[PDB]
Amino acid sequence: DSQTLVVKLGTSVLTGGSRRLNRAHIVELVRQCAQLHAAGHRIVIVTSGAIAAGREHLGYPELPATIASKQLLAAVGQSRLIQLWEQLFSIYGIHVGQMLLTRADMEDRERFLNARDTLRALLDNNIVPVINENDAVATAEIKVGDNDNLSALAAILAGADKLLLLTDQKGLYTADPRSNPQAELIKDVYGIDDALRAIAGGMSTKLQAADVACRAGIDTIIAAGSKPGVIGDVMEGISVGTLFHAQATPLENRKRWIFGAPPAGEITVDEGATAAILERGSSLLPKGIKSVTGNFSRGEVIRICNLEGRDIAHGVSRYNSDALRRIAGHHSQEIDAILGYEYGPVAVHRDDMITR
């Protein structure tokens, strides 16, 4: 059925090795993405090339060879890059959204929940998210990587099924193709070991991204951007590059997410909502909450118990402690009236909750 694919396109794929973005290759890839999008799939694009767009837009000026010059070029050219993406996608009647994320945002619980919420909102409305790194405050991908770890983090955030990394090479080779005439492309890989890290070598960052994505239960595909119909075959299942299989299930990833750290808060729930959670496996509404203990923000993991005090679930909170205390015992429609804002009608969602 419907699937989620995260396509990562580097600077070499977008420019083709030249000093300018090659719009013909990008329009071919956009055509493939639109073909997939029309069939009901969800597409997330992690892009680079803001520095190239800024350099072209400014007339290729002479700047100091420092990080600040790259930050300036990225700041000037992020607008041009997103404008190009929107213009190319509007040919096929598709809208494009812009998200600027950093690793620190992914590490923060509240920021992670906010980013996941806006990404889900974009995906539910048939809008393609285009994701880059915020180069104003973070300079990690400028120095090394070129949005490689950002792609893995975006795949984890989007709940993707596949992560396709497009590069200039065809994939992973057992030996050097030039030196060894018998060197062959590796078809499937089950776990990254020291031998693969040694044979791989520019390909180290992609290997780290693949390891991170596969440890979270996402299948990674390293392929060549110039191969015709690469995105469509990746979605269908045809082998086009190197395939790294998921080393875990999504349930294991959710277990690690919930139980990685001790709960930040403690909430008590009446009998009816306890029965709804246990027997029916449904979400937790603010009506059933009786007491709120602890000082925690939105997105933190809290412990849900019954009136007797027995732990019954662990789940992430969609509201911080103060809002939960203020809206406890009320109906959903009143939440906005109580707070002036609304995150949704549930306090703890069922997909973010693990029953103990």
CB contact set of 138 (below 8 Å; sequence gap of 6+): 102, 103, 104
For residue 114, the partner it binds in ligand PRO, its own copies, none, with Cβ less than 5 to 8 A by kind, is its own copies
For residue 343, the partner it binds in its own copies, ligand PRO, none, with Cβ less than 5 to 8 A by kind, is its own copies
> Is position 300 an interface residue for ligand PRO (rule: CB under 6 A)?
no
- Whole-number Cα distances in Å, 236 to 77, 171, 229: 34, 18, 11
Residue with tokens 């709804």: 276
- By beta-carbon proximity to ligand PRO, the closer residue of 131 and 196 is 131
Among candidate residues 46, 37, 156, the one with its CA nearest the CA of residue 100:
46
- Give the footprint of its own copies on residues 255-284 (CB under 8 A): 280
> Is position 102 an interface residue for ligand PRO (rule: CB under 6 A)?
no
> Is position 136 an interface residue for its own copies (rule: CB under 8 A)?
yes
CB contact set of 200 (below 8 Å; sequence gap of 6+): 172, 207
For residue 334, the partner it binds in its own copies, ligand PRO, none, with Cβ less than 5 to 8 A by kind, is its own copies
- By beta-carbon proximity to ligand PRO, the closer residue of 49 and 159 is 49
Which region holds residue 179: left if phi is over 0, alpha if psi is between -120 and 50, else beta?
alpha
Q: Among 42, 71, 106, 133, which residue interacts with ligand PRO (rule: CB under 6 A)?
A: 133
- Give the footprint of its own copies on residues 139-158 (CB under 8 A): 139, 143-144
- By beta-carbon proximity to its own copies, the closer residue of 111 and 254 is 111
> 204 among the known binding-site residues?
yes
**Residue 70 CB, nearest distance to ligand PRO (Å)?**
7
What is the widest separation between alpha-carbon atoms in the chain? 72
What CA–CA distance (Å, rounded) separates 200 from 216? 22
Size of the site for its own copies (CB under 8 A): 90
Q: Among 39, 118, 294, 356, which residue interacts with its own copies (rule: CB under 8 A)?
A: 118
Beta bridge partners of 96: 128
> 167 among the known binding-site residues?
yes
- By beta-carbon proximity to ligand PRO, the closer residue of 49 and 286 is 49
Question: Which residue stretch of 23-31, 45-53, 246-254, 277-285 sits at the interface with ligand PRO (rule: CB under 6 A)?
Answer: 45-53
- Give the footprint of ligand PRO on residues 256-295 (CB under 6 A): none
> Is position 26 an interface residue for ligand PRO (rule: CB under 6 A)?
no
Helices 23-38 and 67-89: crossing angle in degrees, nearest 10, is 50
Are 227 and 240 in contact by the 8 Å Cβ rule? The answer is yes
Are 171 and 164 in contact by the 8 Å Cβ rule? The answer is no
- Give the footprint of ligand PRO on residues 51-80 (CB under 6 A): 51, 74
> Is position 48 an interface residue for ligand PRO (rule: CB under 6 A)?
yes
The alpha carbon of 309 is separated from its chain's Cα centroid by a whole number of angstroms, namely 37
For residue 92, the partner it binds in its own copies, ligand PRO, none, with Cβ less than 5 to 8 A by kind, is its own copies
Residue 288 tokens, joined: 């059933």
> 239 among the known binding-site residues?
no
Task: Tally the C-alpha atoms within 13 A of residue 105's C-alpha that lie toward its C-beta.
Answer: 18
What CA–CA distance (Å, rounded) separates 194 from 214? 16
* Binding site feature residues: 8, 48, 135, 147, 167-168, 202-206
- Contacts with ligand PRO by CB under 6 A lie at 11, 48-51, 74, 132-133, 135, 141-142, 146-147
